[PDB]
Design an enzyme around this catalytic site. Structure first.
Site: not given
Ligand SMILES: [Mg+2]
Ligand SMILES: [Mg+2]
Lengths: 612, 622
Positions: B512, B597, B599
């Site tokens: 990011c 992302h 995650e």
């Protein structure tokens, strides 16, 4: 005198009522202090007493975020700690019945930031913060304000009471009074619970505002299909997962989602559970404050909050934490987010914080409406939001008494020509006769009632009244009806003054050779305007069969000429006037008859015409 | 409150709770609580009543239940079902505050099993039509009430359950004259009746003819609805008829006759009624007054004797206590007779078995419409019925299958990892990672996922000083702000890290914010997205493989190039949107990066994607 009664009578300067999860209310009291940090909370060393015991009730204010290096508008709100010196449970229903009502109307009730102003701030956050990479979502507070008159805690007890009875889907409903500050609220969201190393959080976001008319299945579905709302929830899920990843080594595990139904709105929600053995003070410190009421990423959210809120937050978005021990000495935490809550000061000034999770596809007017929906139940708890008392209804009821019998409305106490006259009333199985007696009495007649089969001396009376009753008047196979034929034949033959009513009027008609017919639409319980021997009258009918004739006068053997009052269109007979008698199809005595007594008097006066 | 608690714990085998109307405007509601002995007199003459006595205070003597059958005392016909005259001596009498009482009454499952009307709607409608045609239409009378019976079975029946129904009735119903539960040992009565039968106080007798019924819509009552009702000819005739009939009754018991007041609208929970009152004076013995007033025309008809004849003809079943009287007989402070009596309508009779009977009828007149009268019976029984089987007790909106489904959908096509049990969940197996935090605790989530792939992990801050020999890969984390803002000290520091990693050939994965900065360092332009990608799942082509990933970004790198040569680096491969040129990911000689992302809860197969990023970044290592 239990603790709850002592709280009720102002004997507890510092207390809490907390309705958690018969539903029971937890009742706490003890000493207030204001420690300087979460490190300094007065917690003893571990001890297991053999039962669950609460140690501290703590109120963490927004400014406590200094402990994390984050900037806040510092308004001096203390960290409050109340030692649970005493703790009892009382039945929710019993407690509430004990709580006296009170005027808790909010004076000079208004938002510090009005709708137009709040909308501009919302737009600004979306354009200038979310739109410049400050983060993905943010909560901006505004504050519903008002003044309670003659403020004392009893008023907070009253608000707690209404909250308990009216709000649903709350996690905690409570009133906490510290001495200098009172908190009353119905919060839907735990902050952090801890039981046997199991930590739980409850990211809640997404809001369905119930219409005034109540929630609908269609409304809910349209909400559950709203992309804005769905994204909103996933975003706080993610954020809370970060928090749980920090306090729990193995991270969080999501479960859900669920629909939390409250009184004025519904929320979507998830749950996250994980394992941790961190000290309760650390856990509190590290979870200040839920993203659902700050934003994300959290540090940038505090920055954004400071840029757009001119005032400090007080306890809004803060934590109320019950810290305690299980039976075996293990740490326990039950904590809730201070939203949907009023802070009240000693003066009676009420502050209710409320915000909304602002996202890239938020619409400003909706978020404004969302804040109103969120404060709605608490606000109603202060100022709760007849057909008979309506002037249309009062008017329509008054109309029912126009153009009916005056007699029966007159006081039973105070209500020549006929005065002195003695009447006999013959009962044909209809106690209308008792009403006839009362009205004749009012004209000055002395009256006596008897039955059709009874044997009577007809010299003791000046006029005989042949009463009404059920049945078909053509039915001479009914012994009662046959008996009435016998009476009338006898009265006519003897030339004795009489007045026949309804059934007997009908029978008399048969005896005189006038036909009886059954009305297709019966005249049973109906007031009708009629020409009664050249005078408009309004009278009550209770009849199905009726005498019918084309003739306005009839000459009958053994009688003479009988005058007939009838409907000229239908030929239906309303009344007879004979040489020695009168009769009526209708009931002069009825509440449906206007000027009944007059009409009966004219009937009687006529019947006794050959006497003099 | 000891009489009440004793009632509560089974210690009064025979009792009554009666919430009466008396109470002055600004006073708590109170409940009268009676107990004593049951007896079964053979007649009203023989009611166990003592000679007159005065104590200086009001005192109740007897609570009497008069069954319909008792009409034999007047020579009227009746289906005889054995229902006895029941008399309960008021040996004890206390009053409790309604709110305290109700709180003390335990709740219970009082759901009515095998709930049905004995005469169903179609059947009842036929009986109604018949009565209008064959009775009113042949001169039997003007109006008539024909009973039917709502029936059901309470499971595990005891009086506690009756107390529960009484409780809900007190909470829900309004405009009742009496709300009560009376338990005789062998029979239990619970109800909310709007109509007194006869009161008597200092010779003053009162009756209350009620008839005419406005059925509240499910939505609630309206002013328009009420006005339409108050203008209905049928309904206004109905009330005038019943007025006339009660006037006759009052003419018989009161020498000087009755005096009318009213009318009024009585508002209840599910319906409203129109009503009058009639008052007068009498000195007759209470037994005579009860006998002569059996039973109100509003629940029998008119003329009365013919009504009983009509009722007998059209009802198979006897009536029980339906349309009967519940009478409190007593004395005033100085020995005068006292009567408070109520009409047993809107009431349940429960037997020892648990079987429940709720009689209900409607006043039938010449212009009655049979289906309306059907619906009227439902509205009349509705409050009581709800006291047994409340509506709020039914399933929640949330449990509706459309809602259950839409919630379930929220979990389709998102991150499986975060739903997996936390403890719970070759080639990267030994590998040591350092995660550099740029002010976004997404790093803790990256750690968990890397860990699940077998990496050992450590999290540090951007300004921290570390020895990078201790790690095989560095992960440069996400954070807030503008990646073009090199005047921000935090952002400056990310630039310094990435330059250093690249220059050293140290394996790294940029996420990011750091992915964006890495793009700047490589000469790829940065832009603000017109519509930000903040909290969104998007399907993308990731180096030739469809992925669904979660974005939390406002700025983005943009390029026309799918591959580029960069000085001091080498050849970098670029995964981008072919329509807009937006860069999603970079694969360099010694590193990898992602705009999104991996995650996040919004990313599908995140751990795999991370593993592939890491696997790639370390590709020159041995
Ligand atoms: Mg929202
Ligand atoms: Mg009706």
């Amino acid at each position: 005198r239990n603790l709850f009664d002592r709280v009720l009578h102002g004997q507890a300067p510092c207390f809490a009522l907390i309705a958690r999860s018969r539903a029971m209310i937890d009742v706490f009291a003890g000493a207030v202090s204001y420690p300087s940090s979460l490190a300094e909370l007065p917690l003893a060393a571990p001890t297991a007493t053999g039962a669950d015991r609460q140690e501290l009730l703590v109120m963490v204010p927004y400014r406590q975020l200094h402990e994390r290096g984050f900037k806040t508008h510092d308004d001096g709100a203390p960290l409050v700690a109340i030692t649970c010196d005493e703790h009892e449970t009382v039945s929710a229903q019993l407690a509430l019945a004990a709580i006296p009502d009170a005027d808790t109307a909010l004076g000079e009730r208004h938002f510090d930031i009005d709708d137009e102003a709040y909308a501009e701030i919302v737009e600004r956050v979306i354009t200038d913060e979310i739109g410049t990479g400050a983060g993905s979502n943010f909560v901006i507070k505004r504050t519903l304000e008002g003044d309670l008159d003659d403020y004392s805690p009893a008023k907070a007890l009253a608000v707690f009471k209404r909250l308990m009875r009216r709000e649903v889907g709350a996690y905690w409903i409570f009133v906490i009074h510290t001495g200098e500050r009172t908190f009353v609220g119905a919060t839907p969201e735990r902050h952090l619970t801890l039981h046997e190393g199991c930590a739980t959080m409850n990211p809640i976001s997404g809001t369905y505002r119930y219409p005034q008319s109540g929630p609908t299945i269609d409304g809910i579905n349209a909400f559950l299909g709203d992309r804005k709302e769905s994204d909103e929830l996933y975003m706080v899920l993610d954020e809370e997962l970060k928090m749980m990843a920090r306090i729990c080594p193995a991270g969080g595990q999501v479960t859900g989602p669920h629909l939390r139904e409250m009184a004025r709105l519904a929320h979507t929600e998830y749950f996250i559970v994980g394992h941790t053995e961190a000290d309760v003070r650390d856990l509190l410190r590290e979870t200040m404050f839920a993203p659902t009421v700050t934003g994300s990423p959290i540090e940038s959210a505090t920055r954004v909050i400071a840029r757009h809120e001119r005032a400090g937050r007080g306890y809004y978005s803060g934590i109320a934490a019950l810290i305690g021990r299980d039976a075996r000495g293990g740490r326990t935490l039950d904590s809730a987010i201070l939203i949907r809550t009023a802070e009240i000061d000693r003066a009676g000034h009420v502050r209710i914080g409320v915000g909304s999770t602002l996202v890239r596809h938020s619409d400003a007017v909706s978020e404004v409406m969302e804040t109103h929906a969120k404060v709605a139940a608490l606000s109603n708890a202060f100022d709760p939001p007849a057909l008979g008392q309506h002037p249309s209804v009062q008017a329509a009821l008054r109309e029912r008494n126009e153009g009916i019998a005056d007699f029966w409305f007159r006081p039973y106490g105070g209500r020549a020509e006929l005065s002195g006259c003695r009447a006999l009333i013959v009962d044909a199985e209809d106690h209308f006769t008792a009403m006839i007696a009362q009205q004749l009495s009012s004209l000055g007649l002395a009256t006596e009632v008897c039955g059709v089969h009874d044997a009577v001396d007809l010299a003791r009376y000046d006029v005989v009244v042949m009463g009404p009753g059920p049945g078909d008047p053509s039915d001479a196979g009914d012994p009662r009806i046959a008996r009435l034929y016998a009476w009338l034949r006898h009265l006519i033959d003897e030339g004795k003054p009489f007045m026949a009513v309804c059934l007997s009027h009908q029978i008399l008609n048969a005896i005189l050779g006038i036909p009886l017919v059954r009305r297709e639409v019966p005249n049973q319980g109906i007031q009708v305007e009629i020409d009664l021997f050249g005078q408009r009258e309004r009278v009550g009918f209770y009849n199905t069969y009726v005498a019918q004739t084309v003739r306005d006068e009839m000459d009958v053997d053994g009688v003479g000429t009988v005058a007939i009052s009838r409907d000229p269109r239908t030929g239906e007979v309303h009344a007879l006037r004979g040489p020695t008698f009168s009769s009526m199809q209708f009931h002069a005595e009825s509440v449906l008859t206007v000027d009944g007594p007059r009409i009966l008097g004219e009937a009687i006066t006529h019947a006794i015409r050959r006497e003099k």
